[PDB]
Symmetry: C3
Subunit: 216 residues, 3 copies
């Protein structure tokens, strides 16, 4: 027996719960296991979109040895804090993808990814911990994505890009491909703004916006 | 028995007729009902892409009590005029979606929407009359869309956005999310240009273009 | 009996080989025919993502009268050179599309197109030789695409656009629709940059970038 959850019942989680249901009911063929929301804003249990929603204290108290959690909180500092808590409490991180999520050949994705509908992860891609690939995003060939990286919808991450830990890529941003000899790097904790057109390396901790992308 | 139609046999209608066929033949499982084009440019009936195409006078004359019409005219002033005519003549507005259109939980859409392939309508969204969501568009969580709103392809409408009546959002435009306390508003009859990156409220009747969006 | 190949085992080919497998195994229902990579960088055969990869000399030497090749090299000058070689050696060009590629009514596409996942080719479109439509691209109604045209991912080619031979359209570019009386023309060998917002005719051989698009 198993219990599933989406951690976060705000916008990120409410737009991922249908995806977690595709992952569980269809891709895993599991019509038996329960799925709930976890949200620490809750004191008493409530329902959110027809699912039971409870705080983490209550989720921990469930008498099941086999718990699986998708963290659906876009803020990657929160997501890492929760992931470390879950692993320490013996709860499994759970990767979710949609029926329309396309995964190509020789792709490695660490546990706990949120891979939205219409996402493509192309050939020979490696992705670290609790990746968020929101609706329509793609990661093209030979990319290396670090831990707790977050894509907004419709991110165009072209080939031979290396995105370091905790970077955030905003809605509709486009990143130029690297080459085998020179991957294009997005530095640790960098923020690429909505609609940014990135044609050069982004330094660690930089905020870049516009077409062409510039420091903000 | 029933008769279906796509009103408009120009570009909007010719790119929606396949979608209306997915809605009718597959999602409704109806292999019996006829589907035609209506276009008031026509005097004599013709064929358009292998479908009978007639003017509205001829469509009205069909002896069937049960008529269902998708209005496939992007101009929302025309679309409202036609919708009011259809309802007054006792013809039903008909929502169409594609096989790849994704509708999430607790979504309310008024009759007569044109929901193209690869469209996502995310959680807890409310949409008014004869919405056009062209190819690849999305409406994220907690949005409220008014009546006769029109999206070009690939519109990225993020969460907690309120789009008032008759707004037009152009190809590939990106709109920043609001918050629960402050929805980002697109005003009545506003025009957001192709590729605009919108990060603030757009006044009623405003035309905005560019990255960042500015008045035109 | 038949033999299939993807010509190019770098990023373009490795992200198209899964698509060629959808075309062959599912859309053609062919679980018998072998599929390999061709790449002229190779001396000895190798494997690429679990497929045999060989140079063109070795592919020619295969004793099969019935060879079918998708050219997965984005550079259109190389693609034309290879296509002319294949036809002269009595090898067939092979169109590939994905399970999620949407083709609408009265569409004409010459042999050898690479039509990626999530691509839409809308109503009444005509496309010439070895077209590349990378992930998420669309070509809307009444477009005429010439020979050896190349789209990056997420190109938004709106209606009544004429793209002449060997043009290249970059990632996420948006092109304004033409009208029946005045198609918007992208000239022969023009380059439209990533994220460009094109609202006017692009001259032959021009390079245009930005929002709005300007000469580079
Ligand atoms: C880039 C970003 C991080 C800046 O955040 P911020 O520092 O809070 O920015 P503000 O909203 O205060 O705006 C700062 C200024 O830059 C502009 N700006 C903000 N984001 C911009 C963007 N993506 N492109 C261009 N200009 C932008 C604002 O209009 C403002 O201009 P002003 O000083 O002339 O009034 C943010 O705007 C962004 O792009 N976030 C991603 C949103 C998103 O992708 N949503 C998806 C969730 S599903
Ligand atoms: C914004 C828009 C409404 C302006 O329409 P318009 O007033 O007829 O504009 P024009 O074509 O006369 O162009 C006005 C000027 O702004 C520029 N411009 C037009 N649209 C622009 C856009 N989206 N972004 C930036 N600049 C734009 C033009 O190049 C022109 O510049 P110029 O005066 O230097 O020559 C229109 O260009 C647009 O974006 N419409 C949406 C197209 C679309 O989404 N198609 C989808 C159908 S499937
Ligand atoms: C437009 C393009 C062809 C220019 O190529 P290039 O001539 O080699 O350009 P460079 O990389 O030398 O950049 C030239 C300058 O223009 C800028 N630039 C490049 N591409 C740009 C773009 N799309 N938009 C805006 N500015 C751009 C660069 O930042 C640079 O600025 P600088 O001189 O201030 O340093 C190229 O950048 C491009 O857009 N190619 C498409 C990439 C793509 O679509 N990938 C998909 C493959 S899956
Ligand atoms: C306001 C905003 O920009 N939200 C955007 C954000 O939504 P999130 O749900 O990630 O963020 P939030 O709206 O701040 O909500 C976070 C939720 O996490 C919960 N939480 C938190 C910490 C914790 O330790 N436990 C816990 O449970 C917290 O109680 C809250 O319900 O990213 C999405 C991808 C966007 N679509 C959405 O618009
Ligand atoms: C030229 C242009 O920009 N067209 C764009 C427009 O196409 P539409 O078909 O909406 O607009 P149109 O090309 O002006 O055609 C309108 C059609 O509606 C018909 N009609 C009208 C009024 C009426 O009362 N009865 C009636 O039938 C009219 O006869 C005509 O055939 O929006 C699409 C989404 C775009 N893809 C397409 O490029
Ligand atoms: C570096 C770069 O920008 N690559 C981009 C390019 O990849 P390509 O595979 O088209 O280009 P390449 O990386 O230069 O590789 C070309 C390949 O074609 C091969 N080849 C060539 C000639 C010939 O006559 N025989 C032959 O076989 C050549 O040996 C090589 O393996 O377009 C894709 C759509 C992008 N995703 C990808 O990032
Ligand atoms: Cl898209």
């Amino acid at each position: 027996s198993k219990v599933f959850a989406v951690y976060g019942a705000s916008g990120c989680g409410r737009s991922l719960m249908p995806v977690a249901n595709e992952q569980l009911r269809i891709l895993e063929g599991d019509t038996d296991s329960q799925i709930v929301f976890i949200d620490d804003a809750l004191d008493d249990n409530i329902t959110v979109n027809g699912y039971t929603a409870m705080n983490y204290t209550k989720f921990k108290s469930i008498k099941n040895d086999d718990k699986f959690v998708l963290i659906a909180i876009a803020n990657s500092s929160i997501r890492q804090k929760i992931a470390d808590k879950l692993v320490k409490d013996g709860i499994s991180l759970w990767t979710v993808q949609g029926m329309t999520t396309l995964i190509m050949d020789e792709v490695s994705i660490d546990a706990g990814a949120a891979l939205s509908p219409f996402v493509t992860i192309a050939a020979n891609v490696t992705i670290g911990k609790c990746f968020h690939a929101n609706l329509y995003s793609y990661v093209e060939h030979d990319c290396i994505i670090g831990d707790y990286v977050t894509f907004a919808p419709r991110v165009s991450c072209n080939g031979n890009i290396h995105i370091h830990d905790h970077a955030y890529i905003g809605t509709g941003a486009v990143i130029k491909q690297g080459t085998p000899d020179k991957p294009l790097i997005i530095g640790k904790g960098a923020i690429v703004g909505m609609g940014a057109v990135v044609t050069k390396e982004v330094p660690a901790g930089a905020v870049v916006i516009g077409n062409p992308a510039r420091l903000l």
